A paper describes a structure:
PAK4 is a kinase with strong links to cellular transformation and cancer metastasis, as reviewed. We have shown that Cdc42 directly regulates PAK4 activity in mammalian cells through an auto-inhibitory domain (AID) that binds in a manner similar to pseudosubstrates. We have identified Inka1 as a potent vertebrate inhibitor of PAK4 with a Ki of ∼30 nM, which has a much higher affinity than the corresponding AID. The recombinant 38 amino acid ‘Inka box' (GST-iBox) is a potent of PAK4cat inhibitor in vitro but does not affect PAK1, suggesting Inka1 is a specific group II PAK30 inhibitor.
On the basis of these experiments, we hypothesize that Inka1 stabilizes the ATP-bound crystallization-competent conformation of the kinase domain by preventing ATP hydrolysis through binding tightly in the cleft between the N- and C-lobes. This in-cellulo iBox–PAK4cat structure determined in space group P63 was verified by comparison with the structure of the complex determined at 2.0 Å resolution from P41212 crystals grown in vitro from purified PAK4cat and a synthetic iBox 24mer peptide. The packing between the N-lobes, as observed in the in-cellulo P63 crystal form, is also reproduced in the in-vitro P41212 crystal reported here and elsewhere121431424344, and in an in-vitro P212121 crystal, demonstrating that this interaction is conducive for crystallization. These two crystal forms support a range of apo peptide inhibitors and small-molecule inhibitor complexes with PAK4cat. The disposition of the core Inka1 sequence (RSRQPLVLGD) in the current structure shows docking in to the substrate-binding pocket (primarily via R-2 and R-4 interactions) and the inhibitor chain runs parallel to, and hydrogen bonds with, several main-chain residues of the activation loop in a β-sheet-like manner.
Numbering used by the authors:
A (entry chain A): 297 to 589
B (entry chain B): 178 to 190
The structure:
């Protein structure tokens, strides 16, 4: 009990940066309760730069070992559509991850207050899929794809974030089985805790497409647990606003929201899909952001 | 209903 705490803390120490970041970070401004703790922005004293700091209490996780994943897996990851992690530290009983601050905030604010058009939807889906093709080719599953995990720059550039539940697969351990995600976005094979791969993020992306069209995921008013039962048991959920979606968006969505995971399109395939040729540039997103509306 | 919060099953606790 105390023994498992102390061991866990020593283990994490081997993968985090040594040192106390409190000596260099000032002006903490809370922006969220995120997945697994609080997210603040702060100023780096030596550079004047703003960063985002996620702080996760070691004693408050459902599965403490998941805290190993992001801090190891995302360590020196560079991709234009993925939130960059700068360092991590152990501060008392908290893990702090310091990362790039996305001043445009999250896609959730948009999707609940406005209606994206298909140009904008394709731009988001292209960005996310560029991120997921590269991630998935090196064994990394995100496992919490939803609008809250998509962040924006001031000029409409899109980046994937919230890697806290991400997982690494490999040749010798190619599948995971953990019930991890956000209930309404979870793939049905993951709900059933069957072995699963990168395919799970493709299904969640489908649900996020439903968010972008309808405003919310299917069965959102149902309590989480029954909603999960429905997803597991029913046929693919349908858009409420289907009459407003183009034939190419419908055909795109049909390749995402497939139950049989071996039939579901991969990110690399979806990158070639004609829906994505409608993608707008970063500027097309900017009108939707809270500050411009 | 309408919850945006993640769920992690503590299956090994």
């Amino acid at each position: 009990q105390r023994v498992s705490h102390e061991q866990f803390r020593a283990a994490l120490q081997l993968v985090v940066d040594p040192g106390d970041p409190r000596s260099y970070l000032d002006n903490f401004i809370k922006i969220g309760e995120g997945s697994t703790g609080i997210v603040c922005i702060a100023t780096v004293r030596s550079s004047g730069k703003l960063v985002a700091v996620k702080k996760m209490d070691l004693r408050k996780q459902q599965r403490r070992e998941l805290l190993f994943n992001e801090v190891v897996i995302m360590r020196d990851y560079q991709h234009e559509n993925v939130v960059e992690m700068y360092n991590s530290y152990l501060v008392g009983d908290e893990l702090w991850v310091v990362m790039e601050f996305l001043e445009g905030g999250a896609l959730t604010d948009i999707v609940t207050h406005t209606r994206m058009n298909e140009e904008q939807i394709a731009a988001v889906c292209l960005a996310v899929l560029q991120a997921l093709s590269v991630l998935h080719a090196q064994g990394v599953i995100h496992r919490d794809i939803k609008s809250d995990s998509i962040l924006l720059t001031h000029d409409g550039r899109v980046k994937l974030s919230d890697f806290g539940f991400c997982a690494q697969v490999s040749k010798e351990v190619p599948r995971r089985k953990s019930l991890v995600g956000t209930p309404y976005w979870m793939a049905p094979e993951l709900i059933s805790r069957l072995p699963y791969g990168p395919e799970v993020d493709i299904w969640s992306l489908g649900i996020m497409v439903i968010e972008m069209v309808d405003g919310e995921p299917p069965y959102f008013n149902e309590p989480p647990l029954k909603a999960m039962k429905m997803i597991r048991d029913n046929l693919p959920p349908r858009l409420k606003n289907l009459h407003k979606v183009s034939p190419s968006l419908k055909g795109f969505l049909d390749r995402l929201l497939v139950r049989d995971p071996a039939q579901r399109a991969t990110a690399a395939e979806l990158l070639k899909h004609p829906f994505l040729a409608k993608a707008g540039p970063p500027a097309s997103i900017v009108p939707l952001m809270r500050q411009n509306r | 209903g309408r919850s945006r919060q993640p769920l992690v099953l503590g299956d090994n606790c």
